[PDB]
Chains A and B, each alone.
Chain A
Amino acid sequence: SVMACGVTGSVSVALHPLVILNISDHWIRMRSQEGRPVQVIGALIGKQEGRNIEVMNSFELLSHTVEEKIIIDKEYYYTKEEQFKQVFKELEFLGWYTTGGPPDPSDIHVHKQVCEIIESPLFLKLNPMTKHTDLPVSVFESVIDIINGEATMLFAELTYTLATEEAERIGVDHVARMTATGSGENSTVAEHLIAQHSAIKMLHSRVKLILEYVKASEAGEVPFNHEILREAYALCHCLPVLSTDKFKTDFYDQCNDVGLMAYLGTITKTCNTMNQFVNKFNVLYDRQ
């Protein structure tokens, strides 16, 4: 077993969408080049402030399989290290990433070589063949444990977060707006209401968890979890919200405005269809 049991995260890891973007692109191209989903290996860079680690960017590494062992071209990694120096100074190496499922007895070999380079590398593994609705990205750290009298390096899962800036947020929001359309338009409202469906599902799952906790407290658990059940009941008392004449008036105002806009759009489509029909009819029987 390469996974440590009972070991909690010692540092906080912040991940950016660009890192996941690099991993996905690396896996796709290698799959396209060599058929099956060939495992990819790259490196992680970013800023580290004490125990707070922020992974802002990531890049690829050259590796070779010799004696059924993955040998990372650290010389290429070092050649690429000064290459990224020429563009960015504030970004420092933080760890390496790969693709696959559970850790295999080859990633430990990769990690020990990366641990040789720097003081403390971070290990990230992405699962491109996942089927659940959760993020198939996990961050692991290096821990030394005495197993059967021998010091064996293990991986401890880290409770990383997803940190992003206003820029990236707006950018990917409009990337989703652009995916809402396309050359091969299958459906648009389908994707829209599927997105709302996923959001409502997340909220419903939260409500189910709260209700289950309340029922358990009624049965066992803590009879009163203090501020938690207090705030839960208060929020359930704010569920009605209560609108005023002005809010309903403004809601109906916006609805009427955009409905009039929709009516105008339907009129435009209908008049275009009428123009096409008239153009065809003027050729069907009419002259001049």
Chain B
Amino acid sequence: IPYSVLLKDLEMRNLRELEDLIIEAVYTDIIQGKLDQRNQLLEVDFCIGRDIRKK
């Protein structure tokens, strides 16, 4: 996930709080991955799933 997509889809203005939200999610065992700041990318290795509307 590039940092440009993160700042767009989440109404994220300051990149500093973006990092704080990303680390907060990881440390609560939500997403496992690695952050690439030189290329401004978020490499996620593992993440939890989501729900289904039976469709």
* Direct contact between A and B judged by beta carbons closer than 8 A: yes
Total A-B residue contacts, Cβ distance less than 8 Å: 15
8 A Cβ contacts from B16-55 to A? 47-52
CA–CA, A233 to B54, complex, Å? 11
> Which residues of the other chain, B, contact A230 by a CB distance below 8 angstroms?
49-52
What total of chain B residues lie within 8 Å of the partner, measured CB to CB?
Answer: 6
Which residues in A have their C-beta under 8 angstroms from that of B48?
A: 234
Q: Does A231 interact with chain B (Cβ within 8 Å)?
A: yes
Residues of chain A within 8 A (CB-CB) of B51 are 230
Q: With an 8 A cutoff between CB atoms, is A237 at the interface? A: yes
Q: Is A229 an interface residue (CB 8 A)?
A: yes
Chain B residues lying within 8 Å of A233, measured Cβ to Cβ, are 49, 52
Chain A: interface residue total (CB-CB under 8 A): 8
A217-233: which have CB < 8 Å to B?
224, 229-231, 233
CB-nearest residue of chain B relative to A231?
Answer: B49
Give A224-265 as 1s and 0s: 1 = Cβ < 8 Å from B's Cβ atoms.
100001110111010000000000000000000000000000
B51: nearest residue on chain A (CB-CB)? Answer: A230
Q: What separation, in Å, do the CA atoms of A233 and B55 have in the docked complex?
A: 12
Per the bound structure, the CA–CA distance linking A229 and B49 in Å amounts to 10
Cα–Cα distance between A231 and B50 once the two chains are bound (Å):
8
Residues of B within 8 A of A234 (CB): 47-50
Cα-based distance from A237 to B50 in the complex (angstroms): 10
Give the B-binding residues of A (Cβ under 8 A): 224, 229-231, 233-235, 237
A-B contact sample (12 more), CB < 8 A, given A231-B49, A234-B48, A237-B49: A224-B52, A229-B52, A230-B49, A230-B50, A230-B51, A230-B52, A233-B49, A233-B52, A234-B47, A234-B49, A234-B50, A235-B49
Q: Give 7 CB contacts A-B under 8 Å.
A: A224-B52, A229-B52, A230-B52, A231-B49, A234-B47, A234-B48, A234-B49
- B-side residues, CB < 8 A to A, are 47-52
